[PDB]
């Protein structure tokens with residue numbers, strides 16, 4: 001099964017504990033993910049049911065919390081169902097404070113390349129979405145503080 | 146002897162959806178120019194939330210009106226483009242309750258037509274459509290902004306964007322239309338600039354149909370006009386109503402908005 005992987009790295013002008021407090025909230029992706037209309041959650045193993053806003057090329061996602069480490073600031077999510085042509089999707093989020101208060105976030109993932117679309121379009125599609133979310137994260141943190 | 150104003154019928158429904166994100170603007174006699182009575186009709190298909198569609202319904206005719214009061218001769222393209230860009234600007238500055246990040250993914254198509262005593266002006270941005278029925282013939286007065294429309298594909302790449310098929314041709318894989326009011330996060334790929342047609346009224350004109358893709362995604366131009374044709378043999382509201390019912394009967398799971406303007410003289 002054809003597979004692709006990518007990674008998005010961005011620097012956010014906010015302190016680590018602020019940024020992390022938002023990312024770690026598995027049950028509330030809506031806080032910074034514009035395409036999320038609603039999310040209900042049913043620590044590790046937690047499953048969340050996401051509904052997507054109109055205009056987006058999907059209506060739902062079903063995602064499972066694989067790992068949440070509040071010591072090393074890492075989250076591991078995996079999409080286990082959905083309408084979004086994203087099959088066997090599994091992502092890691094790593095948060096670290098900036099050596100300079102600022103935060104760097106690294107979001108990486110693997111997913112099956114869907115039938116009928118190139119690796120490059122699959123990468124572009126997901127990367128683009130992640131940058132939106134990281135952009136909103138920055139906006140939100142800038143507000144909260 | 147006959148009536149200067151046209152009989153209009155409107156049907157704008159939620160359909161099988163939970164949220165209504167269509168909106169409709171009906172402003173007959175909305176202005177006069179050189180002692181000529183002008184009319185405004187508009188359909189807006191929202192996405193993300195409803196508020197951009199609603200905003201157009203509340204402002205667009207006003208904005209067009211102010212622009213008309215300063216237009217030279219008959220330069221309607223300039224007038225409509227300015228009006229549409231101004232609408233977008235206002236939106237730039239409710240389900241999502243106007244809150245981030247969700248308000249950062251909202252826009253609307255806008256299809257509008259100013260009907261003067263001599264002309265039909267259609268200003269379109271998005272994939273709603275205006276179709277003229279005349280001599281039985283179905284004549285589209287706008288051309289949908291689809292990301293795979295070949296000229297639209299090229300314009301997007303020239304703005305540095307890309308088109309990806311993902312449940313249809315989509316701008317950046319996301320939006321199913323290449324133009325829209327709002328959606329700043331998708332500028333400059335998706336722009337609010339409308340394309341404008343101007344067509345002379347004839348004695349053969351039957352009616353004008355403005356409608357969201359709730360209608361056109363299942364009912365083609367030729368069968369729309371045919372339904373409207375026989376209803377005219379409120380007749381306009383009978384046509385609007387019959388058209389949306391037809392789209393629902395063809396299992397439309399989308400909001401449906403149909404406007405039917407009667408063009409021939411009466412009373």
Ligand SMILES: [Mg+2]
Pocket residue numbers: 052053054055058059
């Ligand atoms: Mg949906």
Ligand SMILES: [Mg+2]
Pocket residue numbers: 054166167190191192
């Ligand atoms: Mg819509």
Ligand SMILES: [Mg+2]
Pocket residue numbers: 217223
């Ligand atoms: Mg001028």
Ligand SMILES: [Mg+2]
Pocket residue numbers: 190357358359399400
């Ligand atoms: Mg629609």
Ligand SMILES: [Mg+2]
Pocket residue numbers: 272358362
């Ligand atoms: Mg459609």
Ligand SMILES: [Zn+2]
Pocket residue numbers: 194195196197239240241242243248251
């Ligand atoms: Zn809203």
